[PDB]
Design an enzyme around this catalytic site. Structure first.
Site, short mmCIF file in Angstrom:
data_model
loop_
_atom_site.label_atom_id
_atom_site.label_comp_id
_atom_site.label_asym_id
_atom_site.label_seq_id
_atom_site.Cartn_x
_atom_site.Cartn_y
_atom_site.Cartn_z
CD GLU A 35 29.14 56.60 65.55
OE1 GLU A 35 29.95 56.64 64.60
OE2 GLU A 35 29.49 56.35 66.72
CB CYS A 65 39.38 54.00 59.23
SG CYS A 65 40.24 54.31 60.80
CB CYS A 113 29.52 59.82 67.90
SG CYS A 113 30.55 60.02 66.42
CG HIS A 135 44.82 55.91 63.41
ND1 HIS A 135 43.74 55.85 64.27
CD2 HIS A 135 44.29 55.95 62.16
CE1 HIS A 135 42.62 55.86 63.57
NE2 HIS A 135 42.93 55.93 62.29
O1 LIG Z 1 33.37 56.28 63.43
C1 LIG Z 1 33.50 55.81 64.57
N1 LIG Z 1 32.40 55.69 65.42
C2 LIG Z 1 32.51 55.69 66.99
O2 LIG Z 1 31.94 56.86 67.59
C3 LIG Z 1 34.00 55.64 67.44
C4 LIG Z 1 35.01 55.68 66.51
N2 LIG Z 1 34.74 55.52 65.17
C5 LIG Z 1 36.10 55.95 64.37
C6 LIG Z 1 36.98 57.12 64.04
C7 LIG Z 1 38.22 56.38 63.69
O3 LIG Z 1 38.33 56.30 62.30
C8 LIG Z 1 38.10 54.98 64.31
C9 LIG Z 1 38.73 54.84 65.68
O4 LIG Z 1 40.16 54.68 65.54
P1 LIG Z 1 41.17 55.08 66.75
O5 LIG Z 1 40.61 54.40 67.97
O6 LIG Z 1 42.55 54.55 66.38
O7 LIG Z 1 41.16 56.59 66.82
O8 LIG Z 1 36.71 54.66 64.33
ZN LIG Z 2 32.53 58.96 67.18
ZN LIG Z 3 41.65 55.99 60.47
#
Ligand SMILES: O=C1N[C@H](O)C=CN1[C@H]1C[C@H](O)[C@@H](COP(=O)(O)O)O1
Ligand SMILES: [Zn+2]
Ligand SMILES: [Zn+2]
Ligand SMILES: O=C1N[C@H](O)C=CN1[C@H]1C[C@H](O)[C@@H](COP(=O)(O)O)O1
Ligand SMILES: [Zn+2]
Ligand SMILES: [Zn+2]
Lengths: 173, 173
Positions: free
Chosen positions: B86, B19, B115, B74
């Site tokens: 999670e 990501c 989540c 994004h």
């Molecule tokens: O995997 C987790 N765990 C938490 O619950 C919050 C976001 N993340 C993620 C999903 C995404 O890839 C990123 C958040 O990016 P954005 O805030 O740009 O949507 O982190």
């Molecule tokens: Zn999440």
């Molecule tokens: Zn991403």
């Protein structure tokens, strides 16, 4: 996950060890996820290594290291009191009911003969380690290869996500 | 194991994420051993976030960061394409058949509403995180507490076994 990643996770796991000689960490990974972990230490109701070494006067300050003159006494005690990292990772799988068949084991230190033979019979198909154990001899991994287990090594130099200043492995003088 | 230890393991796990916005890592621990892990990313046969951001021109060099002007684009894409850390840790347990009932979850970032509600219903009894998610609001953890889940926080300052120079978390400009 990347070998360097899981190996470093095994190193963090090793920091939980109370052994005064070596800190060892083992991680069992299945299909990319960690399903078991382990570090060398005593069983329940058993005195921890560091505490026993303290009572016996095996240690030397600066942060305590196992005196070279007492390592022999430590090995004898450890052989019958401390479960090795690799076996602890496997033991938890048996106790918890998690199949490790076909899994990969990551261990900070190359397994001793007792652990190698157990690994060969565990169903694990790949073993990745970093450092070569103090008391190991050449060909120590034959039993693993003959069992159909792939054995790979990743040098410490490729592990740069850890602050080695705060990671203790060999704790002897 | 120690909270600081597992949290840092979650941080190593997060480095596997592709990501371009945030790198998140989650670890499920049961009776002191890791039984599952996860990081945010796309499913199988799905293009990885970093690669999609490249095609879309969302990135800026020095080592690429997600441009602030493109974070919105994004988030929209990510919401329907990337599984959060999670959930990935929980999904593997369901796919592999590993019970997480009564387990503890460690996650680098405080969970988003999607989540949090899933965690509250998963059987997990304790959630430990480090950083507070960008898009989270106060009381975000109420749903967890009402489910009987303990929520604890460990500041980055207590995590000193990692070389933070090589750990990427927030990747936005
Ligand atoms: O995997 C987790 N765990 C938490 O619950 C919050 C976001 N993340 C993620 C999903 C995404 O890839 C990123 C958040 O990016 P954005 O805030 O740009 O949507 O982190
Ligand atoms: Zn999440
Ligand atoms: Zn991403
Ligand atoms: O747990 C592992 N994994 C490897 O198989 C070899 C040893 N170790 C252990 C057992 C013991 O606590 C320590 C070795 O210390 P001595 O070499 O002083 O016996 O590391
Ligand atoms: Zn010992
Ligand atoms: Zn051994």
């Amino acid at each position: 996950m990347k070998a360097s990643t899981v190996l470093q996770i095994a190193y963090l796991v090793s920091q939980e060890s109370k052994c005064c000689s070596w800190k060892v960490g083992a991680v069992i990974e299945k299909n990319g996820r960690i399903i078991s972990t382990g570090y060398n230490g005593s069983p329940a109701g058993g005195v921890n290594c560091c505490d026993y070494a303290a009572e016996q006067g095996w240690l030397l300050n600066k942060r305590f290291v196992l005196a070279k003159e007492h390592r022999s006494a430590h090995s004898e005690w450890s052989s019958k009191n401390e479960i090795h990292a690799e076996l602890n990772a496997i033991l938890f799988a048996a106790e918890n009911g998690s199949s490790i068949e076909g899994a990969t084991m990551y261990v900070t230190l190359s397994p001793c003969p007792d652990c190698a033979k157990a690994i060969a019979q565990s169903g694990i198909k790949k073993l990745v380690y970093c450092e070569t154990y103090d008391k190991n001899k050449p060909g120590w991994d034959d039993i693993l290869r003959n069992a159909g287990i792939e054995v790979f090594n990743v040098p410490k130099k490729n592990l740069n996500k850890l602050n080695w200043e705060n990671i203790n492995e060999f704790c002897g003088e």
